[PDB]
Structure 1
C-alpha cells in the first residue's frame, strides 16, 4: 500500500513549498490522482485479503473505506477554499498539512495488519482533528468542543490498549490474520466480560452510541466545515472497521452482553431521530442524524450475521457520502447568512435552483430512496434483525419514518416557502461549492449501478 502511502506523504513537501496561490490547485489535483490510484484497490479475491506486506493488508472491507478517504480528501480541499482565503500562506499550508496527515493516518489505519498497529494510527487521528476543530473553529465553545471530543474517545481508548497488550501475552500475537485463524472460544468467566468490554466501548464511544454520543453534537455542529465532513464521513466509521475486526475473537460472549447496548441503541436512533426533528440549528440536525444512522450499524455489527455485516458496510459508505453532502450543504447556507438557524433562511428555492436540487436528493438519500445504497445497507440490517427477532421491525421502521419526517423538514424550512426580503446577500451560487456537491452525488448513483463492490468481504 506504499504505492498510496509514499505519494500521500509526498504531498507534504509539495504542499509546504508551493507558491502562495498554487497550494489549492496543486493539492486538489494530485489528491485526486491519489484517489484514482486508490481505485485500483477495489480488486478483491474470493476470500483472501490482499497481503501486500507483513505490516499492511487489505480486503473488501478496508478498500471501500480506503477509497472513501482518498476520494474525500479533495472535497474538503475545495470546501475550505471559501473561508480560508482570509489567511496567511504559512497557516494555510498548516491547514493542508493537517488534512493530509489525517488522510495518511487513515490509510495506515485501514491497511494495518495487527490490532496494536491499527490502534496507534486509529487514535492518532485525534491530533489532526483536534487542531482542526479548535484552532480553526468559529465560536467560543469550540474550546469546550475539543476537550469533549478528545476525552470521550480517549476515555474508551485506554481500556482497549490494556486489553490489546493483554492479548499479546496470552494468545502470543496481535496480528488480525492469526487472531481470526487461531480464534478460540471465549469463556464466560467474570474477567472475560471486562475483557470483552474493554475491546468494545473504545469502538462504540466514537460510533457514537446512545448516551455516549454527546461529543458528536458538540463537535460536528461546531468544527470547521472541512473537519466536519471527515469527522462524520469516516471518523465515526473507524469504530465500524475495528468492530468487524475485534469481533473475530470475542465469541461467544456477544450473545449475552450485546443486549445492554442493543436496546440502548434500539431505543437510541428513535430517540435521536426525534431530536433531529426538533432542532433549531442546521448542522445540529445532520449531526444528530449521523448518530441516528450510525445506530443501525451498531445493531448490524453486534448481531453478528453475514447479512448485517454487508448492510453495515453499505450503510457505512452511503452515510459518509450523505453526511458529507448535508454538512457541505449547511456550510453553503451558513456562509452567506453567517448563522446556522434553521428557520432563519427558509424559502430559498426561488433564489437557489441548483441548491434546491442539491437539497433534494441529498435529503432523499437521507430518506434513502430505492435503490440507493443507503437502503441496501438499511434493508439488509432489517432482514438480519428480523431473523434475530420479529418484534424488532416496529422500532427502526418507526425510526426511518421519523427519519423521513425531518429529512423533508429542513427542505420545507430552508427551500420551500418565501424568501426573507431583508436578506439581500444571497449571491449567485459559485461553481466551487456547486461542483463540490456534484462530486458528492455522482459516485452515489455510480455505486448504485454496481453496489457489489461495497458489501465487504462477506459478499
Structure 2
C-alpha cells in the first residue's frame, strides 16, 4: 500500500502479459475466460484506485502517494497525484470495467481484444500519475499503439485510413512537444515535474527568423506543448482526425477514445501550459478564446448536417471540448474549476452516447440516421436512456453537463464578453442537433420491415448504463463531490498564474 499508483498503473498491463502467455484455446470457452479475466482485472484496478480517492486529502495541494525510484539515462520514475489529476485517474478506472462489460457479445479475436484494452488502461492511467517529464511523454505516446490496432483490427470499412490518420496526426504534434521537454530538461537540469512547476523559464522577448517571439522562450515552449495538446483535445481546426478515428473505431474503442484520451489534452494544459508557461498563456489567451468559440459554433453546425448518427456524437465532443479550452485559459478559479468539471462530466455523457449508438448498431449494423425511426415503439428502455443522455448532452440543469458548461462560460465572461456571447450560443445549437438526432432515430412510427422485430436493451446492456446515469445525476445535483477535491488545487494554480503575469 506504498506503491498504490504503480500497482493501478501496471496491474492491467501485467494481466495482459499473463493472459497472452497462459491462456490457450480459441473456442468460446477460451474467449469466455478472457472476458472474465479482463472484467476481474478492470474491477480490481477500480477498487484499488478507490483507496487513492478516499485517502486523498484535498487540502494538501502538494503531490500525494508519491513514489520515486532511479531510472535509465539519468531520469527518474516518479508518480503522484494532486487535486487536479486524481479525478482523471478515477475516471479512467471507472470507465474501463463498463467498457469491458459492453464488449461481452464480441466474438472476433476476443483474447486479443481484451489484451489491447488491458494494455491501454495501464498506459492511460500512467499519463495522469506520472511526475517525470519524460515518463509523462512515454505514457502519452505509448497509448497510440494499442489504439492504432484497436481501430485497425476491429474498426469499420474505412479503418485503415482512420487508424493511420489517428496515429500520425497525434504523433506529429507530440514530437514537437518532445523537443520542448528536452529543452526544459536542459534549462532546469531536471525532468522532475514538481521542480519544473517552480522553475522560472525565461520570458524576455527575442527574434526568431522574420518575426518577434512575444514571450521569448516561454512562448516557444508553449507553442510546442500547444501543438501536442491542441491536436489531442482536439481543438479546431486540428480536429479532423477525430471524426475518422472515433467513427471508424469499434464501439468500445469510441468510448475510451472520447471519454478518456481527449482529456489528456486538457489535463496537459492544466499540468504544463498554465503552471510552467504563465506569461505565454496570458499572451495566447485571446487566440485560444476565439479558436474555442469557433469550435463550439463550427462543429455544432457541422453536427447538425450529419447523416451518420455516430458522426453527430463525434462532432459533439469537439464542441464540448471547446468549453474546456476556454475555461482553462480564462485562468480564474471559476473557469478552471468548470473546465475540470466539464472534462469529467463529458466522460460519462459522451461514453454513454457511444454506447447508445452501439446498442442499435449491434441490432441493425448501420449508422445512418434514416435507417431508423420510431424505435420507441419497440425499445422503451433504450428511448429513455437515449433521451436522458441526449438531455445531458445539451447541458440540462440537474445533469452534470450543465455545471461544467455554466462555470466555464461565466469564467470567460469575466475576461471577454464577445467570446462568452458566441460560446453561450452553443446552448441553442446543442439543443438543435441533439434533439433532432433523437427525434429522427427514436420517435415517430415504426414503418420499416427491418425494424419490425428489433429487440429492446438486454439486462446486461441496461446494467452498463446505470452507473453512468448515476454519476451524471449525482454530479449534476451535488457537484461539490468534485469541486471539494479540485477546489484547493485550482486555487493554488490560479494564484501562481497571477503572480507570474508581467507587471
What is residue 102 of structure 2 aligned with on the other side? Answer: 79
Q: How many angstroms apart in 1 are the aligned matches of 2:288 and 2:335?
A: 16
**Structure 1 moving runs of 4+ over 6 Å:** none
What is residue 154 of structure 1 aligned with on the other side? Answer: 171
Normalised TM-score (structure 2): 0.86
Does 2:204 match 1:178?
no
What is residue 458 of structure 1 aligned with on the other side? Answer: 490
Q: How many angstroms apart in 2 are the aligned matches of 1:80 and 1:188?
A: 53
SS of 1:253 mapped into structure 2: helix
SS of 2:248 mapped into structure 1: coil
Alignment partner for residue 344 of structure 1, among 342, 350, 371?
Answer: 371
Q: Note the C-alpha offset of 1:97.
A: 0.9
Q: How many angstroms apart in 1 are the aligned matches of 2:261 and 2:445?
A: 37
Q: How many angstroms apart in 2 are the aligned matches of 1:269 and 1:45?
A: 32
What is residue 270 of structure 2 aligned with on the other side? Answer: 244
C-alpha change, 1:445 and 1:36, in structure 2 (3 Å) is farther
SS of 2:490 mapped into structure 1: coil
Q: Which range moved further: 183-192 or 439-448?
A: 183-192
Residues 203-244 of structure 1 show CA distances to partners (whole Å, capped at 9, x for unaligned) of 011111111000000110110111110000010111111111
What are the ranges of 5 or more consecutive residues in structure 2 without an aligned counterpart?
Answer: 24-28, 69-77, 207-212, 492-503
Q: Is the contact between residue 186 and residue 249 of structure 1 (CA under 8 Å) also seen in structure 2?
A: no
Superposition pairs of residues 49-198 of structure 1, within 5 angstroms: 49-54=63-68, 55-82=78-105, 84-85=106-107, 87=108, 91-139=109-157, 141-184=158-201, 186-189=203-206, 190=213, 192=217, 193-198=219-224
Q: How many angstroms apart in 1 are the aligned matches of 2:48 and 2:447?
A: 47
Q: How many angstroms apart in 1 are the aligned matches of 2:443 and 2:316?
A: 21
Q: Which range moved further: 53-62 or 438-447?
A: 438-447
Q: Note the C-alpha offset of 1:62.
A: 1.6
Q: Is the contact between residue 185 and residue 251 of structure 1 (CA under 8 Å) also seen in structure 2?
A: no
Normalised TM-score (structure 1): 0.94
Q: Note the C-alpha offset of 1:185.
A: 5.7
What is residue 497 of structure 2 aligned with on the other side? Answer: none
Q: Note the C-alpha offset of 1:429.
A: 2.6
C-alpha change, 1:378 and 1:432, in structure 2 (3 Å) is same
Q: How many angstroms apart in 2 are the aligned matches of 1:205 and 1:13?
A: 31
SS of 1:388 mapped into structure 2: coil
C-alpha change, 1:6 and 1:169, in structure 2 (3 Å) is closer
Q: Note the C-alpha offset of 1:5.
A: 3.1
Q: How many angstroms apart in 2 are the aligned matches of 1:431 and 1:188?
A: 62
Q: Is the contact between residue 269 and residue 396 of structure 1 (CA under 8 Å) also seen in structure 2?
A: yes
Q: Is the contact between residue 116 and residue 174 of structure 1 (CA under 8 Å) also seen in structure 2?
A: yes
Does 2:16 match 1:5?
no
What is residue 35 of structure 1 aligned with on the other side? Answer: 46
Does 2:231 match 1:218?
no
SS of 1:335 mapped into structure 2: helix
SS of 2:367 mapped into structure 1: coil
- The number of equivalent residue pairs is 453
SS of 2:335 mapped into structure 1: helix
Q: How many angstroms apart in 2 are the aligned matches of 1:214 and 1:275?
A: 12
What is residue 254 of structure 2 aligned with on the other side? Answer: 228
Q: How many angstroms apart in 2 are the aligned matches of 1:393 and 1:120?
A: 36
Residues 95-152 of structure 1 show CA distances to partners (whole Å, capped at 9, x for unaligned) of 111101110011111100022210111111100100000111121x111101111111
Q: Is the contact between residue 315 and residue 374 of structure 1 (CA under 8 Å) also seen in structure 2?
A: yes
Q: How many angstroms apart in 1 are the aligned matches of 2:51 and 2:410?
A: 32
Q: Is the contact between residue 151 and residue 159 of structure 2 (CA under 8 Å) also seen in structure 1?
A: yes
Q: Is the contact between residue 342 and residue 410 of structure 1 (CA under 8 Å) also seen in structure 2?
A: yes
Does 2:287 match 1:260?
yes
Q: Note the C-alpha offset of 1:13.
A: 4.7
Q: Is the contact between residue 10 and residue 122 of structure 2 (CA under 8 Å) also seen in structure 1?
A: no
What is residue 384 of structure 2 aligned with on the other side? Answer: 357
RMSD of aligned Cα (Å): 1.7
Q: Note the C-alpha offset of 1:449.
A: 4.8
Q: Note the C-alpha offset of 1:39.
A: 1.7
Q: How many angstroms apart in 2 are the aligned matches of 1:174 and 1:33?
A: 31
Q: How many angstroms apart in 1 are the aligned matches of 2:127 and 2:84?
A: 12
What is residue 317 of structure 1 aligned with on the other side? Answer: 344
Residues 151-203 of structure 1 show CA distances to partners (whole Å, capped at 9, x for unaligned) of 11111111100010000111122222111223456233325333321121100
Does 2:462 match 1:434?
yes
Q: How many angstroms apart in 1 are the aligned matches of 2:10 and 2:423?
A: 44
What are the ranges of 5 or more consecutive residues in structure 1 without an aligned counterpart?
Answer: none
What is residue 440 of structure 2 aligned with on the other side? Answer: 413
Q: How many angstroms apart in 2 are the aligned matches of 1:201 and 1:169?
A: 21
Q: How many angstroms apart in 2 are the aligned matches of 1:266 and 1:188?
A: 29
Q: How many angstroms apart in 1 are the aligned matches of 2:378 and 2:369?
A: 17
Q: How many angstroms apart in 1 are the aligned matches of 2:481 and 2:399?
A: 14
Residues 51-88 of structure 1 show CA distances to partners (whole Å, capped at 9, x for unaligned) of 42121110122221111111111222122222x22x3x
